[PDB]
Structures are given as C-alpha cells and as structure tokens.
Design a protein around this ligand. Structure first.
Ligand code: NAG
Ligand code: NAG
Lengths: 213, 211, 223, 106
C-alpha cells in the first residue's frame, strides 16, 4: 500500500484562507478518489469533501477540494475562516482493498498572537537510578497554537521506543501545555554522550540537551 | 446462463464457454451480463448462436505492457471480485494516471469466420472515467476489411442494476478467414481475450418445461 | 435523516473479547456497505474492517485480521464487530461509517458519508497502584533572569487523580502541575515544577506533597 | 422516474440541436453536452448536433424526439448537462383501437 502525509499544524486569522495539503507516498494521487473528514473535538468525524472536490449538502461553499498531480497532493482549502472551523482534518484515499488515512492536521484560528513553547528538560534522579530505572522529563509550557511535535534523540540519533507524549491541553492563561516522558534503563542512560528533547512548533525547533552528571 | 453470456463469460456461464450442441435451450432466468450492459444487435447475435452448433474458443493472444489488466468487481463475483472470463477490463497505471494510445491487432488464421466481441465502458461520471482510464477525450476505433466503426464513451448515471450505475456496451463483428481486426484505444475499452468459432449447425428454442 | 448509533463499549482485560453493535436507521440498510473505523486516544483515524450489503464479502485490515470478525443482520438493521484476542494497542474509539457504495473493495472507494457517534473500548490490566515519587533536582546553580526549575516526579500511578502541593500548601506562586500521561502500561504519570529564585538554592527546603486517595498513598518529598 | 402503474409507460424526451456552438453555449453554457437514457430493456445516449441549417418556420434550430416504453416497476434515469427537452407527463395506453389514414368525411 501507500501512506498519506499532512502537516500536523496549520494556523490562520479569521476571514483569511488556509490550505491543508495531503501527499501520497506511492502511486499517483489521481488514480483514486480522495476524501476530507473533519473532526471537531468531542464529536464524531463528518465528511466535508468526497470524490476530491464535492461538498455534501450542508457544507459551506468556502470548503473546496483539489488535486495537484504534479506534486502528487490533494489540497483542502477554506475561505473566510470561522471560529467553528477549528478542528482536526484527515485526508483519505484508497488502494486495492486498503483504506489509507492521513495523519491528521490541527487547524487553529488564531485568537491570540503566536507564542513559541518553553522547554525544560530534566535528567533522571539519582534515586530512580537506584531503582534500576531511568526517566527523562521534557516539560513544554505556554505555547499557542496547541500543536507540537516531540522528538527524542539518543546522543545523535532518533529514539522512539519508550516515549510517552501528552496531548496539548489549555493552561489557565489560554495557552497550551504538554509533557513528554522518555523511559530508559540506567545502563542505556550512562551509555551515550547526551540526550535531547526536540519540540517543534509552527516550523521552529527548540532543542534542549541533558547529560549524565 | 444467457445465450450471449457464452461469448463474454459472466460467472453464470462458466460452464458454457465452449459447449457443443444440436439443440440449445434458453430459459427465462438467463442473464447475459453480470456488470450491467446490453449487446448492440443482440437478437441477430442470438439468432447466429442458436443455429451455431456450439462455440470453440481460441485465445487471441493480446499482451498489454505497463497498464492495469485486472479490472474486477463484486457484481461479476467468482472467488471475490472478478469480471467476464473471456475479456479484460483495461485500466490505467497506479503510478501514472495516463492510458497510453494502444494498437492491438488479431489475424484469423482459421478457415471459419471468427466471432470477435468487445465492450465499451460508460463510467458513472467523467470523474470516474478520468480516475480509471486517465483524463482527456477517450476514443476507441475498430477496423477490418469489411467492418469499421469507432466509439466514444458516454459517461453518466444509469439506473442501479447489481449495484452499479455504469454500463458496458458490447459490440461484435465477424472476421473472415485471413482478415485482420485492429483495435486503437486510449481508454474505456473492454478487450477480448479469446475469439469464438461456430462448431456446426443446431437449433435453439425458448422454453420453461422439463427436459 | 441518517443516524447511526454504537453500543457495547467497556473495559476489558487483555486477552478478552467484546462484541460491538452499531444500530442503523434512516436509510435502506441492506443496500449500503458498512465499515468500522477506530481512533486511538490522541492519534489519527484507522480503518478496521468492512462488510458488503449482502453480507457475503467481508474485508478486514491487516492489524486485526483473524482476531476481528465482522457480521450484520439486515433484518434487525444492526451491525456487529466481534473483537477477540484483544490487546493494549486495540484500545480506541470505534465508529461505524456508512459506505457510499453497495460493494466494498472494487477499484474505487468514494469514502464514507455518515459517522456514528462512537464507543470507547478500553483494554488494560488495570491494577490500582500507588505512585513512586522522585525529586527533579534543579540545574547546577544556573539561571536565566533569576529563575530556576525544580519539581517532583509522580510515576506509574493508577488511577487518576493525584494532588501535588508544595510545602503543605504554602507555595502557590510559580507552581505548575502538568496533566498526566496515560503511558503504554495502562497507568498514568505526571510531574509538577516550580519557578523559584536561583538565590535560595541550597539555603532553602522545598517539599512536595503528593496525595493519592484510591491507593491511600501520600508522600512528602524534598528536592 | 419509477412506473407505479400496472401497464407499460411511454416516456418521450427531446434533444435541441442549436444553430451554432455559440447559440448552444448561450443556452446551456460552454462545454460538451451529452444526454444518457437508461432502463432495464433500454440504454442509449445522444449528443446535440449544432451547426448551420436552413430555416423551417424561420427557425434554423431543430428538436428531435426520442422514446422508450417503461415496463411496470422499471425505473428510467436521465443524465443531462444541457440540450435536454424534459418530459413532464408520461403516457399510458387505454386498451385496443384501430388507426386509419384518410381524406374523406366522417
Ligand atoms: C489464408 O492464408 C493461408 C496462408 O497464409 C493460405 O494457406 C490459405 O489458403 C488462405 N485462405 C484463404 C481463404 O485465403
Ligand atoms: C410492482 O412493485 C410493487 C411495489 O413493490 C409490488 O407490490 C407489485 O407487486 C409489483 N408489480 C409488478 C407487476 O411488478
């Protein structure tokens, strides 16, 4: 089969115009139909596009579908954003008997100026190193919009096993917060040269590093 | 099995692709098609088959290069999705949405005239047509020494039959011995895999009574 | 008005079974193929299986093939999904989605047009556990504009909630207790940190007060 | 349209052949127009033929009519994007009669 790739974060101001792209790894994009589902948080998904451009009855004309065969992409487009358009947007396509879902895109209507996140990275405590355990804590606070990507690196190299990342939730001040805990064992902790927590927000990366002692 | 279903081979007619008879009986429940469609000049072809004595099938030996030849649906269902056993639903590439201009030809080396059949697909919409056979104006031509005719697909919504609102139009000519048939097509083609020859003489009837 | 409704969601120990049932109404149920879509709690959509209008043809996804069995009763306008040999990975929200075609799995898929409200299937060997608190020590007397970062780490606790106060409720300004993460083990975990002046480092005592009621485990910890 | 009566129905429609491709797009817009008619025992498709023609009743356009017969409970379905003269009423036959052609008095 194949895989579809949408951005994690998209943001714009009310009345402006966004586009959410969806790129297909293998096989042409114009070799089967593409959908666009939208999921407002706490509700089931609903379908705003089918057959790559068609609006169901009851979908505002500001939603449009598209297919760019050159970039092998399908692109949703929303004109004149409302506040109720804030949701997650999944693209979908099809193969032999396989239904491929996009990663999902978080569409944020800016209600306050953007704020880069604040990263605070802690090593494992010497006490947990006595429990023969080791845990890295990457605390991410005071960012808007509420979309981040957390990547861990073992001394120069991606490490995805043992990571647990929270869904961003709103703080008291209408800004979002998240956490990410990498689980390790003390033998791997003292093994490498350094450990890093990379937080990606709106196309900017804030990297922090820790080390044994 | 419908009497015309012996030529195309829908799932009902799998046991009647090469029959040989003196007396042929059609029943009221016989359907020539699985994927909805109908034969141009159906009755003439039925009248030809009723006195045919049977059908002999010879592979026409078309080879297709760099397109999709597995076209299938769950209307013509044998194992899972399938299609007519004597024909092939030519689609486009998964890699590229193009259907190359193809030229496929057959020479009747035999002493008896050959029953050549083929289909033209009328997709549910131009969207569907462009998704299967690629974008652009689609055109299929057929030619021999006697017969010549060209076909363009007519996409549109038809009433639901076996779940499909599309239709296939089945056409046919009879190649004389040593003559040649040639198919130009850049999409919307249901190509024949095997040809059909008449085994002798017979009589067909229509009835609903015991044998 | 087309409306779908799912029932049967619950909590299941791994290795167990559960029979979900989606209820259909407002359309000719026999002539529209049906499908089951799931969503992990905080992840994307993932199609699970599908079934034709007749009920003869049944198509499963790879991740669930052989363990899941889909079926339907056209007379009761009801859909079913038999989930067997359940795992932690299969914990998600399950929707029934009306397909646009009669047949599924043929050359072209026009998507779904209606989605049921959903049902939560949770799979975890949920043994109630008291946390184990660890101190998050501050940096080596390094600071930014006077600030500093130290906190307490609550680890491997179940179930929610816990309460983390600092110095028996004295320290309020500069504290931030983060939401818990539901890690792979079926358990929760969270932290809480304070932004303190870098001067009093080494000259003052900061105590974090963790209270877990269901485990009757309450621990004060010093950083 | 579905035939809800106990007798075959007579469905008639028309296609409009405009005087030019300009006339034709004025009425129905730019594009290529195609009408597809389909039932169980019937499926056919028609294309408008615009172009220059001599005048008949001072009109250079034409409207030709087509017709099938819907068997009971059979459903007819049209697909058009222009040049369609749509039927408003179907016709049902009443029984037996006899037709003649004459030029004398009753
Ligand atoms: C057809 O051609 C073959 C040789 O190519 C020849 O033997 C045969 O007589 C021909 N038949 C007719 C009817 O022309
Ligand atoms: C026509 O359809 C109606 C409604 O389903 C049915 O009651 C009736 O028996 C049918 N009659 C014929 C002649 O098809």
């Amino acid at each position: 089969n194949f895989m579809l790739t949408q951005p994690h974060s998209v943001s714009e101001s009310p009345g402006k115009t966004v586009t959410i792209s969806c790129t297909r790894s293998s096989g042409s994009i114009a070799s089967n139909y593409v959908q666009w589902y939208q999921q407002r948080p706490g509700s089931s998904p609903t379908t705003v596009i089918y057959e790559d451009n068609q609006r169901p009855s009851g979908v505002p004309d500001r939603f449009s579908g598209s297919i760019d065969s050159s970039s092998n992409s399908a692109s949703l487009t929303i004109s004149g954003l409302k506040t109720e358009d804030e949701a997650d947007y999944y693209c979908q396509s099809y193969d032999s008997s396989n239904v491929v879902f996009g990663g999902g895109t978080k569409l944020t209507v800016l209600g306050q100026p953007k704020a880069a996140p604040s990263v605070t990275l802690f090593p494992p405590s010497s006490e947990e190193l006595q429990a023969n355990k080791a845990t890295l804590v990457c605390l991410i606070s005071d960012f808007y919009p509420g979309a981040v990507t957390v990547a861990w690196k073992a001394d120069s190299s991606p490490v995805k096993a043992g990571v647990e990342t929270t869904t961003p939730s709103k703080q008291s001040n209408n800004k979002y917060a998240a956490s990410s805990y990498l689980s390790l064992t003390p033998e791997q902790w003292k093994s490498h040269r350094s450990y890093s927590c990379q937080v990606t927000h709106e196309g900017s990366t804030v990297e922090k590093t820790v080390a044994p002692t | 099995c419908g009497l015309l279903g012996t030529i195309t081979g829908p799932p009902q007619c799998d046991q009647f692709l090469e029959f040989s008879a003196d007396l042929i009986i059609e029943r009221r429940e016989g359907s020539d098609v699985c994927y909805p469609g109908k034969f141009v000049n159906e009755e003439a072809l039925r009248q030809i088959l009723r006195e045919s004595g049977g059908i002999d099938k010879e592979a026409m030996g078309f080879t297709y290069s760099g397109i999709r030849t597995n076209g299938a649906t769950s209307a013509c269902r044998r194992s899972g999705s399938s299609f007519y056993a004597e024909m092939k639903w030519l689609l486009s590439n998964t890699d590229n949405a193009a259907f190359p201009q193809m030229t496929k030809s057959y020479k009747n080396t035999r002493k008896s005239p050959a029953l050549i059949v083929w289909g033209i697909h009328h997709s549910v919409s131009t969207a569907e047509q462009t998704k299967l056979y690629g974008s652009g104006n689609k055109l299929v031509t057929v030619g021999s020494s006697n017969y010549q005719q060209s076909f363009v697909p007519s996409p549109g919504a038809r009433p639901q039959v076996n779940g499909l609102s599309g239709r296939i139009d089945f056409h046919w000519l009879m190649l004389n011995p040593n003559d040649t048939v040639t198919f130009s097509f850049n999409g919307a083609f249901i190509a024949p895999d095997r040809a059909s020859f008449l085994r002798g003489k017979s009589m067909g009837i229509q009835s609903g009574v015991q044998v | 008005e087309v409306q779908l409704v799912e029932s049967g969601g619950g909590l299941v120990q791994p290795g167990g079974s559960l029979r979900l049932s989606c209820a259909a109404s407002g359309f000719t149920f026999s002539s529209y193929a049906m499908s089951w879509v799931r969503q992990a709690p905080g992840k994307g959509l993932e199609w699970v299986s599908a079934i034709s209008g007749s009920g003869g043809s049944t198509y499963y996804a790879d991740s669930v093939k052989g363990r899941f069995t889909i079926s339907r009763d056209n007379s009761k306008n009801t859909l079913y999904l038999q989930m067997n040999s359940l795992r932690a990975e299969d914990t998600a929200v399950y929707y029934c989605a009306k397909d646009r075609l009669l047949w599924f799995g043929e050359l072209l898929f026009e998507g779904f047009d209606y989605w049921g409200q959903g049902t939560l299937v949770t799979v975890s060997s949920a043994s109630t556990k008291g946390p184990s608190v660890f101190p998050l020590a501050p940096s080596s007397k390094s600071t930014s504009g006077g600030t500093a970062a130290l906190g307490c780490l609550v680890k491997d606790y179940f179930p929610e909630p816990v309460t983390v106060s600092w110095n028996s409720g004295a320290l309020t300004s500069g504290v931030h207790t983060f939401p818990a993460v539901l890690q792979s083990s079926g358990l929760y975990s969270l932290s809480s940190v304070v932004t303190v002046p870098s001067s009093s480092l080494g000259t003052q005592t900061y105590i974090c007060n963790v209270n877990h009621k269901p485990s009757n485990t309450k621990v004060d910890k010093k950083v």
